[PDB]
Amino acid sequence: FMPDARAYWVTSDLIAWNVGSVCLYASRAAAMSLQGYDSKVELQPESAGLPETVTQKFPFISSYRAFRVPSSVDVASLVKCQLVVASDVTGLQLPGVLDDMFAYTGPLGAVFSEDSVSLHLWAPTAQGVSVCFFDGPAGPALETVQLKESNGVWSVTGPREWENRYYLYEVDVYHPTKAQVLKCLAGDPYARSLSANGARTWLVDINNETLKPASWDELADEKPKLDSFSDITIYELHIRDFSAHDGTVDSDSRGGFRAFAYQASAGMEHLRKLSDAGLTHVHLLPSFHFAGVDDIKSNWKFVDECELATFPPGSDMQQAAVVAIQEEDPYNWGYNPVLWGVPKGSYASDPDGPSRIIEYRQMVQALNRIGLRVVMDVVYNHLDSSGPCGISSVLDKIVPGYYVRRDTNGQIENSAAMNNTASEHFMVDRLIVDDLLNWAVNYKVDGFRFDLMGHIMKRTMMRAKSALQSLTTDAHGVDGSKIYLYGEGWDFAEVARNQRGINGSQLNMSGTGIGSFNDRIRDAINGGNPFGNPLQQGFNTGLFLEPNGFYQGNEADTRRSLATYADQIQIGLAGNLRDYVLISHTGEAKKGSEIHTFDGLPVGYTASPIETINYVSAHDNETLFDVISVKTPMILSVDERCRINHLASSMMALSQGIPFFHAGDEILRSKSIDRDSYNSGDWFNKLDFTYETNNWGVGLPPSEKNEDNWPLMKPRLENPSFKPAKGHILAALDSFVDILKIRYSSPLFRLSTANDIKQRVRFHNTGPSLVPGVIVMGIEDARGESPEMAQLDTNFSYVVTVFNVCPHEVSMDIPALASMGFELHPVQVNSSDTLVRKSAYEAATGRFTVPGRTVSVFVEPRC
């Protein structure tokens, strides 16, 4: 942990300290104790105070007294020393002055020219920097070359023959955690390729023809069309999960980038089916250089799946076997960033050499070719490691205390998980934007999901947006206008309430065109919340309608809560707009922002449907099938729960805004009720594209994150009636595909603006006498002569969707929709589901009849 540092050096000439004569002490050898200083200077207290530039950047110290540093002081020399200020003694946090004096916008990393190669490293506090060249990926150091410094930037220019060498920086710098000037070996923060485990940086030209698959430069011409961000659907997928169990893929490609180049596999046939039905984007879990998995496959440990398959469904033996090797197996979600700009070595066929670059590109190209754009899960909010030691620490090894956020005592913030980054610092902001550009241009990535976006400054998000949009096919080989951004706008810990500045929270990102996950519709549909009691029911898990026995109040309470969830869901169905007006369950008209969650938050908060990512499931927390298996009454058949799964995914698939699906939603995927399977190996994360199993009942999930819920898991996992058969899995997939086809059969499901939604979208089952467990959504198009709106749909003039979660058939009379030519959607008329085909419309009364646990879409044809 970093020492006590309650003072801030914010500008070349200002130090901030919240004390009630102050002196500055410096030691280039780090030889101070409490003595041992080489230099000292008195700081004259500032009358005016801290400049606006400082307080805007570091709001949390706006009350700190200001102390002026004499202009005769050699600040550039001092920031390379061990420093303390005395009143009481404490260290100083330097990011402010480092930015003020050494903000750098020139090239970083390697730059290639015809006859030379240059290296640039930002290390403003270092006393010395050299580059070490190695004999390949595993050989010894062959040569050391000193770099020269200019305003905090170290560089050297060498011959073009430096190309394809391996290197590391040797950085001599004071490390507060060790209270010593240490000589550290570090990779290039601007690395474009690495040896196994990033032990060395590969000095490769990312633009070289030999690193490009055939037709790579023309990929823009092959990319799937995207008319509007409102046409986006997203499928969230882990790279290893995808092919780890796919026997149709060669053993040598399974689990990595190459598996996507196998178009004839069950996995890729699965994705093509979804893609052909309308799915537009595949969101891949972290695929950059992260820690937690050895790049060297021959170091991997595996369990015997044939053996674990013989253990009882609710036994603790499976998780014991996995946990025993989980630190050295091939598996991890990958949320442990080391270097952002390089593909993960473990996902390549060979961690050394060009394969990781070539195969990543082959992956994007393959996905593009089957109609899918690629989204990267980016994790700019924190680092796997900090400190001077370890192969997993890079940034904080080179410029200690700068890239990571720290508290007012100088301790590193860990709220994100560990080693939070400080995007509010100039060079952190730059690195993030440079990285995004790297993936967009060098890998033609189509979009980005931002992990913990609330931990990132909004100005970083907005500049990245403008930088990405500026990319053109003629200048950069990619159309930046089609690149889509979204993230987790969660507001918590040290960044909450704009404490470190305007951050990327849900509320702050309203009106930015950048999406954020809608946790309101998620919890309203499933019930409860990721941290509450697992048995808390929701709109689609039996609240009021089908009590699961867990006491949740009298029926009056549960019915009221159900109606409340219904309101929240409907606001979400209309793009979760802050200004959309809904007739609430009380009969009162309310804007989306005036309808509140149980904890006082505005339900609707966006300025556009494209700012809303509607979801009911994701990689974190329980899968859709598992959450439903836990919250619904145990008496239900798996056949009924299968229909419940489909209702949930259909609520997303037919909502205004951007639907988000967790890989497996469509096939009843289970993790044996694992709520946090980040380290649960292939066993608990199994994706089965033979459709013979869904991975339910493969033992209690790892105790680390699940033990407290084991008692409720065991009875369900052991019950044969909870497990679906192939027939169920295939049925869910067929119905999922049909609902996707319906979304893309009419533009009406995908309105692009708030004005269009306010004008065309109406909910028909509202008020105090609303029918519980039913949502009716109508969407109008231009009809008759002199229409008050444009005509968007050539085939239909009106669409009505009925979500019926009641266990029984319902008849909804909508007089406003009488005397119209509604028919069940042609997709459902020809459905393999015999239930939905019993849906009906009655023109005389405008009565819609919809079977239990069914979503029926009715259309009014134009012809």
Ligand SMILES: OC[C@H]1O[C@@H]2O[C@H]3[C@H](O)[C@@H](O)[C@@H](O[C@H]4[C@H](O)[C@@H](O)[C@@H](O[C@H]5[C@H](O)[C@@H](O)[C@@H](O[C@H]6[C@H](O)[C@@H](O)[C@@H](O[C@H]7[C@H](O)[C@@H](O)[C@@H](O[C@H]8[C@H](O)[C@@H](O)[C@@H](O[C@H]1[C@H](O)[C@H]2O)O[C@@H]8CO)O[C@@H]7CO)O[C@@H]6CO)O[C@@H]5CO)O[C@@H]4CO)O[C@@H]3CO
């Ligand atoms: O940062 C990673 C985190 O991101 C997401 O979480 C966000 C979530 O999606 C948002 O919706 C929102 O959460 C708000 C929530 O919906 C509100 O209801 C309320 O929550 C309060 C609870 O209702 C209340 O019960 C109490 O909860 C306590 C629990 O009862 C108690 O069990 C314990 O919880 C522990 C969890 O059981 C355990 O799983 C573990 O949680 C980790 C998760 O496993 C992991 O996935 C990740 O969390 C994600 C989350 O999945 C995303 O959806 O990290 C978690 C780290 O802990 O540990 C828990 C330890 O607490 O404790 C909790 C309370 O401490 O309190 C809460 C808070 O009032 O308000 C929420 C507002 O925060 O935002 C979150 C992120 O803020």
Ligand SMILES: [Ca+2]
């Ligand atoms: Ca497609």
Ligand SMILES: [Ca+2]
């Ligand atoms: Ca692991």
